[PDB]
Amino acid sequence: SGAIYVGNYRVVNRHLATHNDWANLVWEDSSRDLLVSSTTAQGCDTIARCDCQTGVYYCSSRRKHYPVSFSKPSLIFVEASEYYPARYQSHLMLAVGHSEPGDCGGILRCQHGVVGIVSTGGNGLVGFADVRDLLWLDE
Ligand SMILES: NC(=O)[C@H]1CCCN(C(=O)C(c2ccccc2)c2ccccc2)C1
Ligand SMILES: [Zn+2]
């Protein structure tokens, strides 16, 4: 679990969004596994606006932060699950690293701020849904 709180927005994995998230829906995209809902309180997370390919992510399954090199945002095949059929998930960045179902929502960060959140994993890999292109999160 986990979310990004920036301004009057809450960014979560679309497959883990709550009834409240859907009742205050701003934008959602199944192909990116992202959902953004509105909030009453102000969020103090900074979003990175960069092309860094190195950062640090939080891994709940180990209660530890790990440094990773990650690929640029791209279309990657993701196996079928109870949330989606087999499909290509866009804006996804992969790294070699530990991840388990439960780690979704963990923040990936570089020196510029928040890069994305854990969205896929397994096989000694971890996939992050990128949020750096969502410029409206800041205005
Ligand atoms: N974006 C999606 O479509 C995800 C929806 C939830 C499922 N999913 C995973 O990748 C998930 C997983 C769960 C059960 C078997 C295999 C994989 C996982 C595993 C390790 C770390 C994070 C998540 C795909
Ligand atoms: Zn950066």
Side-chain angles (χ1 to χ4, degrees), residues 34-84:
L34 290 184
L35 183 145
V36 174
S37 57
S38 54
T39 79
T40 44
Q42 197 81 15
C44 54
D45 284 319
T46 286
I47 313 295
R49 301 297 185 201
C50 66
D51 68 342
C52 278
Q53 274 183 253
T54 75
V56 173
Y57 76 105
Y58 180 63
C59 175
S60 329
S61 65
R62 292 288 185 268
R63 295 194 196 116
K64 264 178 170 74
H65 293 261
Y66 295 105
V68 280
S69 291
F70 53 93
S71 62
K72 280 178 172 180
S74 70
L75 268 168
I76 291 167
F77 180 82
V78 176
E79 285 257 25
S81 68
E82 299 95 354
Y83 311 103
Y84 306 108

Coordinates of all heavy atoms in Angstrom, one line a residue, residues 34-84:
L34 N -3.0 3.8 -12.6 CA -3.0 5.0 -11.8 C -4.4 5.6 -11.6 O -5.2 5.6 -12.5 CB -2.1 6.1 -12.3 CG -0.6 5.9 -12.3 CD1 0.1 7.2 -12.8 CD2 -0.1 5.6 -10.9
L35 N -4.6 6.1 -10.4 CA -5.9 6.8 -10.1 C -5.5 8.0 -9.2 O -4.6 7.9 -8.4 CB -6.9 6.0 -9.4 CG -8.3 6.6 -9.2 CD1 -9.4 5.6 -9.3 CD2 -8.4 7.4 -7.8
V36 N -6.0 9.2 -9.5 CA -5.8 10.5 -8.8 C -7.2 10.9 -8.3 O -8.2 11.0 -9.1 CB -5.1 11.6 -9.6 CG1 -5.1 12.9 -8.8 CG2 -3.7 11.1 -10.0
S37 N -7.3 11.1 -7.0 CA -8.5 11.6 -6.3 C -8.2 13.0 -5.6 O -7.0 13.3 -5.4 CB -9.0 10.6 -5.3 OG -8.1 10.3 -4.3
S38 N -9.2 13.8 -5.4 CA -9.0 15.1 -4.7 C -9.0 14.9 -3.2 O -9.6 14.0 -2.7 CB -10.1 16.0 -5.2 OG -11.4 15.4 -4.9
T39 N -8.3 15.8 -2.5 CA -8.2 15.8 -1.1 C -8.6 17.1 -0.5 O -8.4 18.2 -1.1 CB -6.8 15.5 -0.6 OG1 -5.9 16.6 -0.7 CG2 -6.2 14.3 -1.3
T40 N -9.1 17.1 0.8 CA -9.4 18.4 1.5 C -8.1 19.0 2.1 O -8.0 20.2 2.3 CB -10.4 18.1 2.6 OG1 -10.0 16.9 3.3 CG2 -11.9 17.9 2.1
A41 N -7.2 18.1 2.6 CA -6.0 18.6 3.2 C -4.9 18.7 2.1 O -4.9 18.1 1.1 CB -5.5 17.7 4.3
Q42 N -3.9 19.6 2.4 CA -2.8 19.9 1.5 C -1.7 18.8 1.6 O -1.4 18.4 2.7 CB -2.2 21.3 1.7 CG -1.4 21.8 0.6 CD -2.2 22.5 -0.5 OE1 -3.4 22.7 -0.4 NE2 -1.6 22.7 -1.7
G43 N -1.2 18.4 0.5 CA -0.1 17.4 0.4 C 1.2 18.1 0.2 O 1.3 19.0 -0.6
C44 N 2.2 17.5 0.9 CA 3.5 18.2 0.8 C 4.6 17.3 0.1 O 5.8 17.5 0.4 CB 4.0 18.6 2.2 SG 3.9 17.3 3.5
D45 N 4.2 16.5 -0.9 CA 5.2 15.7 -1.6 C 5.6 16.5 -2.9 O 4.8 17.1 -3.5 CB 4.7 14.3 -2.1 CG 4.6 13.2 -1.0 OD1 5.6 13.2 -0.2 OD2 3.6 12.5 -0.9
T46 N 6.9 16.5 -3.2 CA 7.4 17.2 -4.4 C 7.5 16.2 -5.5 O 8.0 15.1 -5.2 CB 8.9 17.7 -4.1 OG1 8.8 18.9 -3.2 CG2 9.6 18.1 -5.4
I47 N 7.1 16.5 -6.7 CA 7.2 15.5 -7.8 C 8.5 15.9 -8.6 O 8.6 17.1 -8.9 CB 6.0 15.5 -8.8 CG1 4.6 15.4 -8.0 CG2 6.1 14.4 -9.8 CD1 4.5 14.1 -7.2
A48 N 9.3 15.0 -9.0 CA 10.4 15.2 -9.9 C 10.0 15.5 -11.3 O 9.0 15.0 -11.8 CB 11.4 14.0 -9.8
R49 N 10.7 16.4 -12.0 CA 10.5 16.7 -13.4 C 11.9 16.6 -14.0 O 12.7 17.5 -14.0 CB 9.9 18.2 -13.5 CG 8.6 18.4 -12.7 CD 7.4 17.5 -13.2 NE 6.2 17.9 -12.5 CZ 5.1 17.2 -12.4 NH1 5.1 16.0 -12.9 NH2 4.1 17.7 -11.7
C50 N 12.2 15.4 -14.5 CA 13.5 15.0 -14.9 C 13.5 13.7 -15.7 O 12.5 13.1 -15.9 CB 14.4 14.8 -13.6 SG 13.9 13.4 -12.6
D51 N 14.7 13.2 -16.1 CA 14.8 11.9 -16.8 C 15.8 11.0 -16.1 O 16.5 10.2 -16.7 CB 15.2 12.1 -18.3 CG 16.6 12.6 -18.6 OD1 17.2 13.2 -17.6 OD2 17.1 12.4 -19.7
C52 N 15.9 11.1 -14.7 CA 16.8 10.3 -13.9 C 16.5 8.8 -14.2 O 15.3 8.5 -14.3 CB 16.6 10.6 -12.4 SG 17.5 12.0 -11.8
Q53 N 17.5 8.0 -14.2 CA 17.3 6.5 -14.3 C 17.9 5.8 -13.1 O 18.2 4.6 -13.2 CB 17.9 5.9 -15.6 CG 16.9 6.0 -16.8 CD 17.6 5.3 -18.0 OE1 18.0 6.0 -18.9 NE2 17.7 4.0 -18.0
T54 N 18.1 6.5 -12.0 CA 18.6 6.0 -10.7 C 17.8 6.7 -9.6 O 17.4 7.9 -9.7 CB 20.1 6.2 -10.5 OG1 20.4 7.6 -10.1 CG2 21.0 5.7 -11.6
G55 N 17.5 5.9 -8.5 CA 16.8 6.4 -7.4 C 16.8 5.4 -6.3 O 17.5 4.5 -6.3
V56 N 15.9 5.6 -5.3 CA 15.7 4.8 -4.1 C 14.2 4.6 -3.9 O 13.4 5.5 -4.0 CB 16.3 5.6 -2.9 CG1 16.0 4.8 -1.6 CG2 17.8 5.8 -3.0
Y57 N 13.8 3.3 -3.7 CA 12.4 3.0 -3.5 C 12.2 2.4 -2.1 O 13.1 1.7 -1.6 CB 11.8 2.1 -4.6 CG 12.2 0.6 -4.5 CD1 11.3 -0.3 -4.1 CD2 13.5 0.2 -5.0 CE1 11.7 -1.7 -4.1 CE2 13.8 -1.1 -4.9 CZ 12.9 -2.1 -4.5 OH 13.3 -3.4 -4.5
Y58 N 11.0 2.5 -1.6 CA 10.7 1.9 -0.3 C 10.0 0.5 -0.5 O 9.1 0.4 -1.3 CB 9.8 2.8 0.5 CG 9.4 2.1 1.8 CD1 10.4 1.8 2.8 CD2 8.1 1.7 2.1 CE1 10.2 1.2 4.0 CE2 7.9 1.1 3.3 CZ 8.9 0.8 4.2 OH 8.6 0.1 5.4
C59 N 10.6 -0.5 0.1 CA 10.1 -1.9 0.0 C 9.5 -2.3 1.3 O 10.2 -2.7 2.3 CB 11.3 -2.8 -0.4 SG 10.8 -4.6 -0.5
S60 N 8.1 -2.3 1.4 CA 7.4 -2.7 2.7 C 7.8 -4.1 3.1 O 7.9 -4.3 4.3 CB 5.9 -2.6 2.5 OG 5.4 -1.6 1.6
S61 N 7.8 -5.1 2.2 CA 8.1 -6.5 2.4 C 9.5 -6.7 3.1 O 9.7 -7.8 3.6 CB 8.0 -7.3 1.2 OG 8.9 -7.0 0.2
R62 N 10.4 -5.7 3.2 CA 11.6 -5.8 3.9 C 11.9 -4.6 4.9 O 12.9 -4.5 5.5 CB 12.8 -5.7 2.8 CG 12.8 -6.9 1.9 CD 13.4 -8.1 2.6 NE 13.5 -9.2 1.7 CZ 12.6 -10.2 1.4 NH1 11.4 -10.1 2.1 NH2 12.8 -11.1 0.6
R63 N 10.9 -3.7 5.0 CA 11.0 -2.5 5.8 C 12.3 -1.7 5.5 O 13.0 -1.4 6.5 CB 10.8 -2.8 7.3 CG 9.4 -3.3 7.7 CD 9.2 -3.2 9.2 NE 8.1 -4.0 9.7 CZ 8.3 -5.1 10.5 NH1 9.5 -5.4 10.9 NH2 7.2 -5.8 10.9
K64 N 12.7 -1.6 4.2 CA 14.0 -1.1 3.9 C 13.8 -0.3 2.6 O 13.0 -0.6 1.7 CB 15.0 -2.2 3.5 CG 15.9 -2.6 4.6 CD 16.8 -3.8 4.2 CE 17.9 -4.1 5.1 NZ 17.4 -4.8 6.4
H65 N 14.7 0.7 2.4 CA 14.8 1.5 1.1 C 16.0 0.9 0.3 O 17.0 0.5 0.9 CB 15.1 3.0 1.4 CG 14.0 3.7 2.2 ND1 13.1 4.5 1.5 CD2 13.7 3.7 3.5 CE1 12.3 5.0 2.4 NE2 12.6 4.5 3.6
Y66 N 15.8 0.7 -1.0 CA 16.9 0.2 -1.8 C 17.2 1.1 -3.0 O 16.3 1.6 -3.7 CB 16.5 -1.2 -2.4 CG 16.3 -2.3 -1.4 CD1 15.1 -2.8 -1.0 CD2 17.5 -3.0 -0.8 CE1 14.9 -3.8 -0.1 CE2 17.3 -4.0 0.1 CZ 16.1 -4.4 0.5 OH 15.9 -5.5 1.3
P67 N 18.5 1.3 -3.3 CA 18.9 2.0 -4.5 C 18.7 1.2 -5.8 O 19.1 0.0 -5.7 CB 20.3 2.4 -4.2 CG 20.8 1.3 -3.3 CD 19.7 0.8 -2.5
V68 N 18.3 1.7 -6.9 CA 18.0 1.0 -8.1 C 18.4 1.8 -9.3 O 18.2 3.0 -9.3 CB 16.5 0.6 -8.2 CG1 16.2 -0.7 -7.4 CG2 15.6 1.7 -7.9
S69 N 18.7 1.1 -10.4 CA 18.8 1.7 -11.7 C 17.5 1.3 -12.4 O 17.1 0.1 -12.2 CB 20.0 1.2 -12.6 OG 21.2 1.6 -12.0
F70 N 16.8 2.1 -13.1 CA 15.5 1.7 -13.7 C 15.4 2.2 -15.1 O 16.1 3.1 -15.5 CB 14.3 2.2 -12.8 CG 14.3 3.7 -12.5 CD1 13.7 4.6 -13.3 CD2 15.0 4.2 -11.3 CE1 13.6 6.0 -13.0 CE2 14.9 5.6 -11.0 CZ 14.2 6.4 -11.8
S71 N 14.6 1.5 -15.9 CA 14.5 1.8 -17.3 C 13.6 3.0 -17.5 O 12.9 3.5 -16.6 CB 13.9 0.6 -18.0 OG 12.6 0.3 -17.6
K72 N 13.6 3.6 -18.7 CA 12.8 4.8 -19.1 C 11.3 4.3 -19.2 O 11.1 3.2 -19.5 CB 13.3 5.5 -20.3 CG 14.5 6.5 -19.9 CD 15.1 7.2 -21.1 CE 16.1 8.2 -20.6 NZ 16.8 9.0 -21.7
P73 N 10.4 5.2 -18.9 CA 8.9 4.9 -19.1 C 8.6 4.2 -20.4 O 9.0 4.7 -21.5 CB 8.2 6.2 -18.9 CG 9.1 7.0 -18.1 CD 10.5 6.6 -18.5
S74 N 8.0 3.0 -20.4 CA 7.7 2.3 -21.6 C 6.5 1.3 -21.5 O 5.9 1.2 -20.4 CB 8.9 1.6 -22.2 OG 9.3 0.5 -21.3
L75 N 6.1 0.7 -22.6 CA 5.0 -0.3 -22.6 C 5.6 -1.6 -22.3 O 6.4 -2.1 -23.0 CB 4.4 -0.3 -24.1 CG 3.2 0.6 -24.4 CD1 3.0 0.6 -25.9 CD2 2.0 0.1 -23.7
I76 N 5.1 -2.2 -21.2 CA 5.6 -3.5 -20.8 C 4.5 -4.5 -20.6 O 3.5 -4.1 -19.9 CB 6.5 -3.3 -19.5 CG1 7.7 -2.5 -19.9 CG2 6.7 -4.6 -18.8 CD1 8.5 -2.0 -18.8
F77 N 4.6 -5.7 -21.1 CA 3.6 -6.7 -20.9 C 3.4 -7.1 -19.4 O 4.4 -7.3 -18.7 CB 3.9 -8.0 -21.7 CG 2.9 -9.1 -21.5 CD1 1.7 -9.1 -22.2 CD2 3.1 -10.2 -20.6 CE1 0.8 -10.2 -22.2 CE2 2.2 -11.2 -20.5 CZ 1.1 -11.2 -21.3
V78 N 2.2 -7.1 -18.9 CA 1.9 -7.5 -17.5 C 0.9 -8.7 -17.6 O -0.2 -8.5 -18.2 CB 1.4 -6.3 -16.7 CG1 1.0 -6.8 -15.3 CG2 2.5 -5.2 -16.6
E79 N 1.2 -9.8 -16.9 CA 0.4 -11.0 -16.8 C -1.1 -10.7 -16.3 O -1.3 -9.7 -15.6 CB 1.0 -12.0 -15.8 CG 2.2 -12.7 -16.4 CD 1.9 -14.1 -16.8 OE1 0.7 -14.4 -17.1 OE2 2.9 -14.9 -16.9
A80 N -2.0 -11.6 -16.5 CA -3.4 -11.4 -16.0 C -3.4 -11.5 -14.5 O -2.5 -12.2 -13.9 CB -4.3 -12.5 -16.6
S81 N -4.4 -10.9 -13.9 CA -4.6 -10.9 -12.4 C -6.1 -10.7 -12.1 O -6.9 -10.6 -13.0 CB -3.7 -9.7 -11.8 OG -4.2 -8.4 -12.2
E82 N -6.5 -10.6 -10.8 CA -7.9 -10.3 -10.5 C -8.4 -8.9 -10.8 O -9.5 -8.6 -10.7 CB -8.2 -10.6 -9.0 CG -8.0 -12.1 -8.5 CD -6.6 -12.3 -7.9 OE1 -5.8 -11.4 -7.9 OE2 -6.4 -13.4 -7.4
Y83 N -7.4 -8.0 -11.2 CA -7.7 -6.6 -11.4 C -7.7 -6.3 -12.9 O -8.5 -5.5 -13.4 CB -6.7 -5.7 -10.7 CG -6.6 -6.0 -9.2 CD1 -5.4 -6.7 -8.8 CD2 -7.5 -5.7 -8.3 CE1 -5.3 -7.0 -7.4 CE2 -7.4 -6.0 -6.9 CZ -6.3 -6.7 -6.5 OH -6.1 -7.0 -5.2
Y84 N -6.9 -7.0 -13.7 CA -6.8 -6.7 -15.1 C -6.6 -8.0 -16.0 O -5.8 -8.9 -15.5 CB -5.6 -5.8 -15.5 CG -5.5 -4.5 -14.7 CD1 -4.5 -4.4 -13.7 CD2 -6.3 -3.5 -15.0 CE1 -4.4 -3.2 -13.0 CE2 -6.2 -2.3 -14.3 CZ -5.2 -2.1 -13.3 OH -5.1 -0.9 -12.6

